[PDB]
């Protein structure tokens, strides 16, 4: 019976500058490691795919998690990007080009309205409709990400219920007998110097929202998170 207020995660951040937030939804309690960094707005990277997918489905710029966009044949850095993608696979593989096409179809006026309705960070898309989340104008703090994700977990955002169910399913990372891990990585892929892993874990006793943010890659952020979630008995089997 975890009391998140009594946690310690210092060791899991060995050799890394980062922050971690865990919100126990059933008890309405939040643990924060490195509160100063938790309050620092940073560029969201591919964690923005969560918001982009919600808006895109809501406004019918994409149909469902299986909405296919054909690859243009341009060889990009990661072979996993060099194939036809859907909304869901491009989230799983962080295939930026798919979400750039989606953002263009949403369009700047609609995107700006939605980020204001959602109070998403600094709401600043001036870096360009298909660039603004990629080490660019938009920023959001780890605590602001947690506030947004709690509303998604509780289905309190201004989106249709089926839209939120689709995006949550798209976030599933791992399923055990006793838990389901949902999450999205983000990385500043130029220098690998900023990383995120944000999401939720559902157990038999309740759900938890987490945000991990680090001066390292999104893969490192995810590995730190999984280490913590195992240490505290939320990832079991
Ligand atoms: Ca440890
Ligand atoms: Ca380091």
From Swiss-Prot:
InterPro entries: Bact_Transpept/Beta-Lactamase, Beta-lactam/transpept-like, Beta-lactam_class-D_AS, PCN-bd_Tpept
Post-translational modification N6-carboxylysine, affected residues: 49
Any one Gene Ontology BP term: cell wall organization
Positions of substrate binding: 184-186
Assigned keywords, A-Z: Antibiotic resistance, Hydrolase, Signal
EC number assigned by the record: 3.5.2.6
Family named by the database record: Belongs to the class-D beta-lactamase family.
Protein name: Probable beta-lactamase YbxI
Species the sequence originates in: Bacillus subtilis (strain 168)
Gene behind this protein: ybxI
